[PDB]
Amino acid sequence: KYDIKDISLAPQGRQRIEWAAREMPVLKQIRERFAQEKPFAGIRLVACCHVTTETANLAIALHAGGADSLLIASNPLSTQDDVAACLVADYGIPVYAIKGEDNETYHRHVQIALDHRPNIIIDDGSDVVATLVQERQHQLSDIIGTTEETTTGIVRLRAMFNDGVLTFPAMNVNDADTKHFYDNRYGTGQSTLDGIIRATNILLAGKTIVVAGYGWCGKGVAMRAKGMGADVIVTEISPVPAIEAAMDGFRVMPMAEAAHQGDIFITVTGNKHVIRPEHFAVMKDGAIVCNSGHFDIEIDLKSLKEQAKEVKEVRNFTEQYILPNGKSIIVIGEGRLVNLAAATGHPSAVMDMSFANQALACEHLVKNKGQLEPGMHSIPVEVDQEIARLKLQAMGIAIDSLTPEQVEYINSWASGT
Amino acid sequence: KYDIKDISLAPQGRQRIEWAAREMPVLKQIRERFAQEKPFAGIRLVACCHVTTETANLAIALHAGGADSLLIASNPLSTQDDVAACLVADYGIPVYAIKGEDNETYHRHVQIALDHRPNIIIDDGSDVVATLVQERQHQLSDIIGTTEETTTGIVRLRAMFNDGVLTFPAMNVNDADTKHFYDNRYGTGQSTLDGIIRATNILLAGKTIVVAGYGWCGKGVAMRAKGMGADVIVTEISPVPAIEAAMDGFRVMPMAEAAHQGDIFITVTGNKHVIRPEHFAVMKDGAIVCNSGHFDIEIDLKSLKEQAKEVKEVRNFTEQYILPNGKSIIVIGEGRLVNLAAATGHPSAVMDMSFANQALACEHLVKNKGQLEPGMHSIPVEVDQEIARLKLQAMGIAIDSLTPEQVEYINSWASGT
Amino acid sequence: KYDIKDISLAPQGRQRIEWAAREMPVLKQIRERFAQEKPFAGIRLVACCHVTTETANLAIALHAGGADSLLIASNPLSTQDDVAACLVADYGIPVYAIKGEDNETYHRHVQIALDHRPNIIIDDGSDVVATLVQERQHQLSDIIGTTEETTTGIVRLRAMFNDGVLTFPAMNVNDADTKHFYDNRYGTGQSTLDGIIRATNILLAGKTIVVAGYGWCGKGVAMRAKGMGADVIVTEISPVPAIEAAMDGFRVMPMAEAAHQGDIFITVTGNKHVIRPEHFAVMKDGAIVCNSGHFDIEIDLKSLKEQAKEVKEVRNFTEQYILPNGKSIIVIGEGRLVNLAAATGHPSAVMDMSFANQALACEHLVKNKGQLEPGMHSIPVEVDQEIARLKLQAMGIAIDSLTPEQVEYINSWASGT
Amino acid sequence: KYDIKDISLAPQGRQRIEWAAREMPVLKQIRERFAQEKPFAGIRLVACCHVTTETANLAIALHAGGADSLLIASNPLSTQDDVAACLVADYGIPVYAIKGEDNETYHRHVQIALDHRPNIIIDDGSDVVATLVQERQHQLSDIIGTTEETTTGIVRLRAMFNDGVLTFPAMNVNDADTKHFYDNRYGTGQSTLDGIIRATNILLAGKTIVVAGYGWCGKGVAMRAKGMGADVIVTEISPVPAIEAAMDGFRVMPMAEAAHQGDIFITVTGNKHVIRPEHFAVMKDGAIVCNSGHFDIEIDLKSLKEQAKEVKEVRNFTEQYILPNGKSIIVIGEGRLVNLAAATGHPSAVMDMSFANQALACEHLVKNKGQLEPGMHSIPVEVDQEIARLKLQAMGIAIDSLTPEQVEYINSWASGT
């Protein structure tokens, strides 16, 4: 069966899935090869992803490859109910995902997914893989391998490995070049600001925007905030990215110093409680806080709730916390991934590459069944490079190639002066 | 002895060396530790570097550490004669380097350097190390290790390794994070445009500027060309950087298509004959070509000379090649590293980090004498990270550090939802 | 009476009106004074504006001042039905505005508005003023004066004046410094991209975006498109803005050349048939065209409809036209101003200044009745400057002030050598 | 006679003058017409300009037109001695200009220039016109008219007019669209940074740069500082440019707040004592201060000299002031316009338009002698626009032209619904 909001939304989901496919040409080619080669024939698969038009196109590709797939939501607020309905009604793919579902429903959906007895698990944040290892030790004989879509998930997998419980292959999709160089940076840079603006309609120009973290996501958010006319502050914990942010023209300072100055705060660290009650207490009246890291725990909303004398919903996706002194803190999307909670996530152009990696990583797991060491594996270089070749070609961009003499010069070392 | 232009220039060199030191605080701390610990006592050292105020401060640091050093020019056009004179007259460091010296003088200087019988060779482009391996097999028992400053040199060292002749440790200074993330990118981005403008006084705004290569240097040049108002075209041979350039807002195309459009061409590829006679023949009348890769071979100037009916020097560092149809091609700095030939190279702020790596790499070689495998070694992570910590501190920038609970969250994998 | 979609939407409208007011502090101050001084007591007023949360705050300020106002939509597609419901239900202000109303309904609303016998007309695009002068010459004795919000309307007023029929005072709100320096530039720059992204979810980075016109709006749209990673082409008819665009780093060319290259076309010229059938014929398959000028006539959609062999809606606000050769053209918002048709228009921060100018322009007409010549009048400098001073204060920015010594220097001509 | 440093520099001057002419095609066209029509036959002319390769091309165009010209320096530090030598030796044009001349020599040169009894005075900063009106009332019958190149001079002319002593026509060259939209913005933006970098070699990326003034010059300097990776602070006295700076992404604050934060200070206000002792007192150790306004009086250097306990030159164009508390302030170019004092001023591409305006303004004064009122006159629109059309053509850029149908639409007011 399935567990969705409204199956009558399927026609609208189909229209939007097909619209998104227009900028997923790499995944389309993979789908067309999968439909002939059937790499997943006889394989059961669980996907824990954001239920978007882009994930739909991925599920359609795995289905064309023969996968017996079950899809559940990676986050209660990111689900697109029309997409869920189209996958069920048009493709017969079980989806357990309702926008705005409560925590008990999420956890029940994880339990249903694990009862599918998957041979492959595609995860986004590593919730299902962690539950599998914790609660389903008897099922590990089913697992051919897993994949992980996002940075937070890769961190949890390293913790599982160092703890000694990562006893199967896990594909590091997030760290492929054609994943986090584009998705994490250019995707999050546009879609994060998109979610902020759809929720608040705020003018970004002239605002001070504090970006916590200057990794791939932070670089993208800061770059686009700057492009929209914001004054950008960056916080960090490591010196190499801090120097980069300064040489990119941004102010770098500790969060305790930024807290007095920011009009908008955006967390993209992967870590817990980056924005804290001692920061809330000194923020400007009306400061906006939101999160684009995988988990809402980057903002200590539990503490905010007890500092505040009152909380009100003042717009879709927008809560106003009023403190005893009468100042307000605005929270978007209850601290959930603001690009997916208040908008539609990354454009399909970058998910084409992220989800091409997902599809080919699953294929890599199956074709190497019984042959991979336990632990984390990076995406093979030749796969990563081929995705980039196909994407560049699909964008209509042509580049150069070395001549035979240029190749010879590379291998000569006596040639200098 | 020494071989320099004019030792009466020493006072001016000293003034300029001390000016440059103001933004080399990391190297100063290393120098002050070196002067007490004397890591290089009894060690002979050859440096093949650009003879600039920044290299001078490096040589002063090695001298304080006890090194018996001899300095020669990495390039005939990059030498600063006042610096050469100050090093000889004020520090007693033999310098063999005359701005504008001919090719025979360069090669004689290399021979003199190798007769110093160095135990350590600091190289920039790998000319001296290649000559050592080619011509001085009997001297290899002297070598404790070598270092290489630039990307072109790292490529030659890989070729030496694959050929089986890299029989000693070579430190990869260029690829340290605190080297090519800053020097290669932000340094070249500013200093390349600096050299173009000092040579030509051209307005960059409104010009089409073709950047060949989108590695660390190409990213920097394109970013600053854009910042100065230029329309930027990027050429490449690999899809991952080509997609980056497009998502950074630049036009990507093959050089044969760019050749018709560019007002200024800048090569930063590391490869041979990237700009070719078939490109010259279709360039706009008055197009400017220059090179910021280590070797002038990136532009096929030999072919340009035979296509042209006439060449004239029309300004300092500036040659006009007139073709039979009357169109002109402008070449800056005879195709040598335009930032160092027509200006003063990178700012000392980034060379602080590059040359801190050089100093600590030499120390690493000495303290591990007889203990390192032959071949290339990367800069130890703890060294690289400490340089970044000290530089950030010296720039007056403070950042955050994780709390104990944040560290615990990193190592928990069961914590999701 | 009134003519709206659904009065039950009033609670949501009220909430959204209050949210927008958070960044309209200058208009709030004006409303509070109007509440005390009642400058519009006994005055009947018609407003033809986009029926948005920002217009609602203006209407509430006019209401506080005693104006007997009637509001109609400036564009069938920009109306926010929840705003219309709140103005009727909560303030008792007659609104004639239904999102998506047909042309006959819009025209009927204009007739009903003129039947209100306004003393003041606030117009956005000059439709109501033109209908008054063409059809209601017998009502001109009612008119104290009118105001005009946008550049297209000013051009119409100019033609009326040159035609001898602008026989009453008309305030040029659009050309106030605190209107078109911010609204037209920074507001359109952000909200045009907002509309495009809400409609299509497209990644802007790496796309070629053609901006027709490099006036206040074109400068903002090109600036923000570039900030979002686009490759930007600008078209023009006048050399001064064309040179500016080039020195701002954009590619300038005739539309016939741009037509082959653009992925997205945005018209902001104020002129008719800037994109024509001969341009559609050479566009890439799937090129997107939209308009941010006041009237959709900037794109020759009538010819596109005749050219095309079929048209279908492929997403909300998004139509696909298929040409007889099978290539497709995507049109957003039926060519109506894409920021208001597919999103929510400008942020309230800039509309604060635009509509402060509207409020004080209406006050100016009433306070100076019988002392203003017929024809166009600019916003008094003292008013324009006070709006800027108050907005800068409300943004929390402090600046310097001239000293007596500096004033003396300005008035001194003999000094300086 | 003449008064120059060294006539033997003429060959180098000639070469550099010819090089600069490559991007002065509009002035070349004007010179060629002047050579034919001789508009200045019998006219005596004085030019007080920066003695640069660009001014030389203007002087050559006036010479071609028959003008009996005499040229003196506009600033003791901007003079290019090789240019002065070429104008004397090759063209026989009297030049009174020595780079680094003292104040008494500058004043003597102004007296010699007025002794030429000019009919036309071209001024840059209005010193010669002010000296004429103060000291040479008996010569006013000589004057056909004057021109003024820069914003400071316009302000002086305004004060003269308000004082009743501007009794002849004076052409406002600075405020022509093709002058201050490009020269003041794009030229100053690039050449100010050029001067700073030539003097100091400092890395701009990661520095905090304070720009005083957000007019045409301030907009350009802030834009290019940001493009080079700086963190940019803007100071102002008027709210309209202050809001613009904020929405352009810069931090706006009073100079007293900026004084603690800046690494580099750049004054472009046109006003006196913008940086004062109370600012020097709180600057970072080693802060750099420079001026790109016409007169050095924007920085209170006289007070700094009194405050300081010592001063020394630490590099070409670079002085270190040491305060009694041991902190140091670095001054570039003795506070004289840093683009011309430490580099070569604007690129010839923008001076092409500025000096085309100068040439045609002088022609306008002669052709309209006896028909111009005393007081200031703007450049005729037709002249301003033709300069733009010719420059855009010479840049190789093509744009569109209105059709008959579009013209009809502009003049139609009844249409649009």
Ligand SMILES: NC(=O)c1ccc[n+]([C@@H]2O[C@H](COP(=O)([O-])OP(=O)(O)OC[C@H]3O[C@@H](n4cnc5c(N)ncnc54)[C@H](O)[C@@H]3O)[C@@H](O)[C@H]2O)c1
């Ligand atoms: N919302 C989206 O669509 C989306 C897309 C990709 C990734 N993500 C998430 O975004 C987060 C960041 O991912 P990434 O790829 O940028 O990771 P990354 O590893 O490249 O960068 C994270 C950066 O944050 C810094 N940081 C860590 N703790 C910090 C703290 N307390 N304060 C300040 N800086 C701190 C780190 O030093 C590092 O530079 C992850 O949770 C990832 O799963 C979200």
Ligand SMILES: NC(=O)c1ccc[n+]([C@@H]2O[C@H](COP(=O)([O-])OP(=O)(O)OC[C@H]3O[C@@H](n4cnc5c(N)ncnc54)[C@H](O)[C@@H]3O)[C@@H](O)[C@H]2O)c1
């Ligand atoms: N002048 C300076 O001060 C300075 C500073 C640092 C490095 N360098 C030199 O600059 C060069 C580039 O170094 P880097 O660190 O950027 O290297 P890199 O390895 O990071 O990047 C080089 C890039 O050029 C591309 N490329 C190679 N051949 C090409 C071709 N024929 N056409 C187009 N693109 C091509 C490669 O794909 C790669 O992306 C080297 O020669 C290096 O030694 C100079």
Ligand SMILES: NC(=O)c1ccc[n+]([C@@H]2O[C@H](COP(=O)([O-])OP(=O)(O)OC[C@H]3O[C@@H](n4cnc5c(N)ncnc54)[C@H](O)[C@@H]3O)[C@@H](O)[C@H]2O)c1
């Ligand atoms: N959607 C919005 O919210 C919004 C906001 C403000 C203004 N507007 C509208 O935007 C339009 C432009 O306003 P503006 O203030 O930028 O006007 P403007 O007068 O400042 O600029 C218009 C520019 O377009 C150029 N142009 C004219 N015809 C052209 C053509 N055929 N091709 C190319 N360039 C051409 C002109 O040379 C000029 O530079 C008007 O219709 C105005 O009412 C819309």
Ligand SMILES: NC(=O)c1ccc[n+]([C@@H]2O[C@H](COP(=O)([O-])OP(=O)(O)OC[C@H]3O[C@@H](n4cnc5c(N)ncnc54)[C@H](O)[C@@H]3O)[C@@H](O)[C@H]2O)c1
């Ligand atoms: N060096 C060059 O090559 C060059 C080129 C053009 C102009 N200039 C000079 O630059 C100066 C500025 O010219 P412009 O065209 O930009 O003038 P402008 O009138 O366009 O702008 C001056 C700006 O400075 C602001 N301002 C005035 N006093 C101030 C103060 N005390 N603090 C902060 N801001 C203040 C004004 O509000 C205004 O916005 C003039 O002296 C002009 O002659 C120099």
Ligand SMILES: Nc1ncnc2c1ncn2[C@@H]1O[C@H](CO)[C@@H](O)[C@H]1O
């Ligand atoms: N449109 C989208 N559809 C599906 N997943 C998305 C979308 N946007 C972002 N994501 C993914 O969500 C992850 C964060 O949980 C990111 O790693 C990213 O790949």
Ligand SMILES: Nc1ncnc2c1ncn2[C@@H]1O[C@H](CO)[C@@H](O)[C@H]1O
């Ligand atoms: N100012 C400078 N002094 C010394 N070396 C430099 C300077 N600028 C650039 N370089 C170095 O020259 C190398 C290229 O040969 C680069 O790797 C870079 O580190």
Ligand SMILES: Nc1ncnc2c1ncn2[C@@H]1O[C@H](CO)[C@@H](O)[C@H]1O
């Ligand atoms: N949010 C908005 N509310 C009302 N009017 C708007 C809004 N956004 C843009 N406009 C106005 O619409 C006009 C174009 O019809 C512009 O002049 C602008 O002032």
Ligand SMILES: Nc1ncnc2c1ncn2[C@@H]1O[C@H](CO)[C@@H](O)[C@H]1O
């Ligand atoms: N290269 C140059 N040659 C001559 N005048 C210049 C140059 N650069 C700037 N100026 C002028 O100097 C004036 C300031 O004194 C500016 O108005 C500008 O037009």
Ligand SMILES: [Cl-]
């Ligand atoms: Cl494939």
Ligand SMILES: [Cl-]
């Ligand atoms: Cl150390």
Ligand SMILES: [Cl-]
């Ligand atoms: Cl008021």
Ligand SMILES: [Cl-]
């Ligand atoms: Cl002419």
Ligand SMILES: [Rb+]
């Ligand atoms: Rb080689």
Ligand SMILES: [Rb+]
């Ligand atoms: Rb965790």
Ligand SMILES: [Rb+]
């Ligand atoms: Rb049709």
Ligand SMILES: [Rb+]
């Ligand atoms: Rb003065």
